[PDB]
Amino acid sequence: SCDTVDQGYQCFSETSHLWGQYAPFFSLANESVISPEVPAGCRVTFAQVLSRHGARYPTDSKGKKYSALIEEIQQNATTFDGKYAFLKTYNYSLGADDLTPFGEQELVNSGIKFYQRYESLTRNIVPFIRSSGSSRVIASGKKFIEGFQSTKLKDPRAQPGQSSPKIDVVISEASSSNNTLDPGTCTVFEDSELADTVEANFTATFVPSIRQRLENDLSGVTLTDTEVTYLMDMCSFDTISTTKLSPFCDLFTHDEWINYDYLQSLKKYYGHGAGNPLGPTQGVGYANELIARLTHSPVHDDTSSNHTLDSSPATFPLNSTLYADFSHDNGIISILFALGLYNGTKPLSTTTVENITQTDGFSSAWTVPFASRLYVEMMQCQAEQEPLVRVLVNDRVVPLHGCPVDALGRCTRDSFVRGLSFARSGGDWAECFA
């Protein structure tokens, strides 16, 4: 009743919305200055959705650490009173790596919403779909298809006998694979430790106090700063693993969650966003593929794209009207920056928390929550002659940069494409090997 198709996850909002990329999707439609609705007198002529996979269990690697830390606390602590009582008998039973049942539901809902928003197109066009080769992503693609098709069957104006969508291309995640959705071939970038340095710097500003409180309340226990953040991570996973808030959430105050949320934004920003010298460069391949689709022209890219894969209509159609791509948070972050969407955002302070007003709408929770979605739509309106482009990120209309935006956040397709000079030139891909 609080996780809906339109609004997303609204349960425990004062806490759940502060989990960064471990936060379930929640609609930012009400936070948008510009109305998300398709303008009266306009008709959508192109729509592409780039979606992240749904909510998942911890990765096997982290699950080990979480489990170990909990058994260790259960052994070393002499007293478990008050809000720590649950810990005495907590039994770690989370799965690993896979999409959770809640995560599956998130994608089904996303499919329903995409179908309804673009009904005039979705009623008789089958979207061309691609997914990065990771089980949780592939499963997310399939759930989205379920939701999308289920809504189409109930539509009286839908075209009878049309085929169902399916995953047309699965891009390998092998280290030697050219994958525009989540590049792994930029050698120098892959070796970068910038995010680790930043994570260390910031946690130092607020975790130590928390650590002291926990060490003091659970006598016999010693914790490193990192382990405390594992306990905060558990609040998220232990809550959405299934109605009730995880007891792990109760161990931290609200201002600590504000800090945690900010820590997640830093990791993404300096790891794959503009904070990293080669961050935005990871998204140019995808951006050039987008330019190809908007203009119905072959791809001109020499970065992350697979030349063979993009040379043929079978694996890269230029005239489908609807497209859907499924990926990871990291690739999406880089793509968002390569599209120039956060050009009005100054480098995030590494010592002090900055609110969403200061960061001009950027945060991990606002850009890459679980099941996040980015829509790129093109429309033709009565007054204008050229088609207009608009981008919504998790339902917030994000004003475009590099082109003359109108009152509704749109740019003509041509000036928009013209504005992506960084991507069209190949970003700083050269720096990947030198």
From Swiss-Prot:
Optimum pH is 2.0 to 2.5 and 5.0 to 5.5. Optimum temperature is 55 to 60 degrees Celsius. Disulfide bonds join C2-C11, C42-C381, C186-C432, C235-C249, C403-C411. Pfam families: His_Phos_2 (PF00328). Its EC number is 3.1.3.-, 3.1.3.8. It comes from the Eukaryota. GO terms for molecular function: 3-phytase activity; acid phosphatase activity. Transmembrane segments: none annotated. InterPro entries: Acid_Pase_AS (IPR033379), His_Pase_clade-2 (IPR000560), His_PPase_superfam (IPR029033), Histidine_acid_Pase_euk (IPR016274). It catalyses: 1D-myo-inositol hexakisphosphate + H2O = 1D-myo-inositol 1,2,4,5,6-pentakisphosphate + phosphate; 1D-myo-inositol 1,2,4,5,6-pentakisphosphate + H2O = 1D-myo-inositol 1,2,5,6-tetrakisphosphate + phosphate; 1D-myo-inositol 1,2,5,6-tetrakisphosphate + H2O = 1D-myo-inositol 1,2,6-trisphosphate + phosphate; 1D-myo-inositol 1,2,6-trisphosphate + H2O = 1D-myo-inositol 1,2-bisphosphate + phosphate. It is found in: Secreted. Belongs to the histidine acid phosphatase family. Catalyzes the phosphate monoester hydrolysis of phytic acid (myo-inositol hexakisphosphate), which results in the stepwise formation of myo-inositol pentakis-, tetrakis-, tris-, bis-, and monophosphates, as well as the liberation of inorganic phosphate. Myo-inositol 2-monophosphate is the end product. Has a broad substrate specificity and is also able to dephosphorylate other classic acid phosphatase substrates such as p-nitrophenyl phosphate, phenyl phosphate, and fructose 1,6-bisphosphate. This is Phytase A. It comes from Aspergillus niger. The gene is phyA.
